[PDB]
Amino acid sequence: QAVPPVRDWPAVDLPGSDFDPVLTELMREGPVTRISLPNGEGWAWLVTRHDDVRLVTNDPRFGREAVMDRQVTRLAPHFIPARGAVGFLDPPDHTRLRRSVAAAFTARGVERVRERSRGMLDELVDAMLRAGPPADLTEAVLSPFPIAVICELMGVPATDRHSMHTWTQLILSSSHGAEVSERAKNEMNAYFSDLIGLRSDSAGEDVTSLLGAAVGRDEITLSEAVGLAVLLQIGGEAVTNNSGQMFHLLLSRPELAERLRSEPEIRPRAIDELLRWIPHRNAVGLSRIALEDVEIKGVRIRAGDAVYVSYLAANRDPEVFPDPDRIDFERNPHVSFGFGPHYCPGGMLARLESELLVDAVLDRVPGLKLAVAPEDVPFKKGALIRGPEALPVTWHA
């Protein structure tokens, strides 16, 4: 028990939204297990229960700053966040940086861009309807919408949306092992250095304006501000893959789609349940290092050891979610947006986007449905975040 066997967790592409069989086995073995991923060196501890995941992610004894130096076993060939980025920061610095933009990401904060976002979405959907079926829901709506929304919230001119997306793709491609010069990945860095440091020098409510003002008041450095802007910009694109899984599920189970289309009142609750259930990523992402000797469920974890949490596993904890594999719109303390200091700042924005998307796609498109069999919809390979490559759809024209 104190010395669990190391389980090898090689990279494997899973069909649609099927749950990882290896994760299912780890969940059955006990609260604390040990794993070895494709990259990095050695092994790491893993926790899967809802309460243990909340502990590891919300306790000062586990830190992110120490992860970078020790080649911890991991899925990705290379990390996305750089040294000093919020992902690799611990309080107090992490707290100081996150607070500079927190008010822009709460429910009250994201409401500011809700009307404009709904307008942009209706234009994308209407353009799709006008062109006629069949179409690729991902290329026509799910991909462009999130990019436009995060750029709007950040204060990035619409004319630069395409550039932002290309830069985001290069950075993510680099994580997959692709060879990209630092000079290539720092283009977004230079872009935000200009926007935050030279422009948006006046009063503003968008994210880059808040960052610029915080730098002006000596609360954060330009470097800290730029690093945060880059990660927020990249993060905004996650809604594309997640909403893609959401619609693949809804269209694969016409019954659920009918329920949402006919019962507007339950959409908020239903979307929250889909967010809990959808297996958003492959394996696990960034670990935390035990900063001192600690114990979890009696298991001794030595200072220096790496510990991963699986939010996907925690979302299926039988204790917290009875009959976990069942999607129940009337079920929900899920942790799809993480837990602890590092919880996703984009959670409320993702909810906003998901709600607008469900409304538009289910109410504006006459008799929407998949144009191919559920099993024939291609999903991303060798990826970190799971999602459809395309979503062929048709409707009444």
Ligand X SMILES: c1ccc(-c2cnc[nH]2)cc1
Closer by beta carbon to Hg ion, 164 or else 195:
164
Characterize 32-49 residue by residue with b for buried, 16 or more Cβ atoms within 10 angstroms of its Cβ, and e for exposed: bbbbbbeebeebbbbbbb
In angstroms, the CA 357 to CA 354 distance is 5
Closer by beta carbon to ligand HEM, 321 or else 395:
321
Helix (H) or strand (E) holding 295: strand 294-296
Closer by beta carbon to ligand X, 31 or else 338:
338
Q: In the set 280, 316, 334, 386, which binds ligand HEM (CB under 6 A)? A: 280
Give the contacts of 121 (CB within 8 A, at least 6 positions apart): 141, 145, 356, 357, 360
| Rounded least distance, CB 246 to ligand HEM, Å | 9
**289: nearest Cα among 49, 95, 90, 80:** 90
Which option in Hg ion, ligand X, ligand HEM, none does residue 336 bind, with CB closer than 5 to 8 A by kind? ligand HEM
Closer by beta carbon to ligand HEM, 34 or else 334:
334
Closer by beta carbon to ligand X, 80 or else 164:
80
| Rounded least distance, CB 240 to ligand X, Å | 10
Q: In the set 26, 239, 361, 362, which binds ligand HEM (CB under 6 A)? A: 239
Closer by beta carbon to ligand X, 86 or else 393:
86
Which option in ligand X, Hg ion, ligand HEM, none does residue 147 bind, with CB closer than 5 to 8 A by kind? Hg ion
| Rounded least distance, CB 351 to ligand HEM, Å | 8
Q: What is the distance between the terminal CA atoms of the chain, rounded to a whole angstrom?
A: 61
Which option in ligand X, Hg ion, ligand HEM, none does residue 307 bind, with CB closer than 5 to 8 A by kind? none
Closer by beta carbon to ligand HEM, 234 or else 365:
234
Closer by beta carbon to ligand HEM, 117 or else 242:
242
Q: Could you say whether residue 285 binds ligand X (CB under 6 A)?
A: yes
Q: Could you say whether residue 238 binds ligand X (CB under 6 A)?
A: yes
Contact 329, 356 (CB under 8 A): no
**394: nearest Cα among 130, 143, 132:** 132
Radius of gyration over alpha carbons of the chain, in Å? 21
Q: Could you say whether residue 249 binds ligand HEM (CB under 6 A)?
A: no
In angstroms, the CA 227 to CA 7 distance is 35
| Rounded least distance, CB 105 to ligand HEM, Å | 7
Residue 5: burial class (beta carbons within 10 Å; 0-12, 13-18, 19+): exposed
In angstroms, the CA 334 to CA 50 distance is 9
Q: Could you say whether residue 80 binds ligand X (CB under 6 A)?
A: yes
In order, the DSSP letters of 163-220 are: HHHHHHHHHHHHHTT----HHHHTHHHHHHHHHHHTS--S---SHHHHHHHHHHTTSS
3-state DSSP assignment of residue 4: coil
Which option in Hg ion, ligand X, ligand HEM, none does residue 393 bind, with CB closer than 5 to 8 A by kind? none
| Rounded least distance, CB 338 to ligand HEM, Å | 3
Q: In the set 86, 213, 270, 274, which binds ligand HEM (CB under 6 A)? A: 86
Helix axis angle, 93-105 relative to 207-216, nearest 10°?
Answer: 140
Give the contacts of 195 (CB within 8 A, at least 6 positions apart): 155, 156, 208, 229
Please give the single-letter amino acid code of residue 388.
P
Q: In the set 344, 348, 371, 372, which binds ligand X (CB under 6 A)? A: 344
Residues in 90-109 at the binding interface with ligand HEM, rule: CB under 6 A? 98
3-state DSSP assignment of residue 306: strand
Closer by beta carbon to ligand X, 147 or else 238:
238
Residues touching ligand X, count (CB under 6 A): 7
Please give the single-letter amino acid code of residue 245.
Q
Residues in 303-362 at the binding interface with ligand HEM, rule: CB under 6 A? 311, 336-338, 342, 344-346, 349-350
Q: Could you say whether residue 85 binds ligand X (CB under 6 A)?
A: no
Torsion of CA 353, 332, 106, 309, to 10 degrees: -90
Which option in ligand HEM, ligand X, Hg ion, none does residue 197 bind, with CB closer than 5 to 8 A by kind? none
The site for ligand X (CB under 6 A) is made up of 80, 235, 238, 285, 344, 384-385
The site for ligand HEM (CB under 6 A) is made up of 57, 86-87, 98, 150, 231-232, 235-236, 238-239, 242, 280, 286, 311, 336-338, 342, 344-346, 349-350
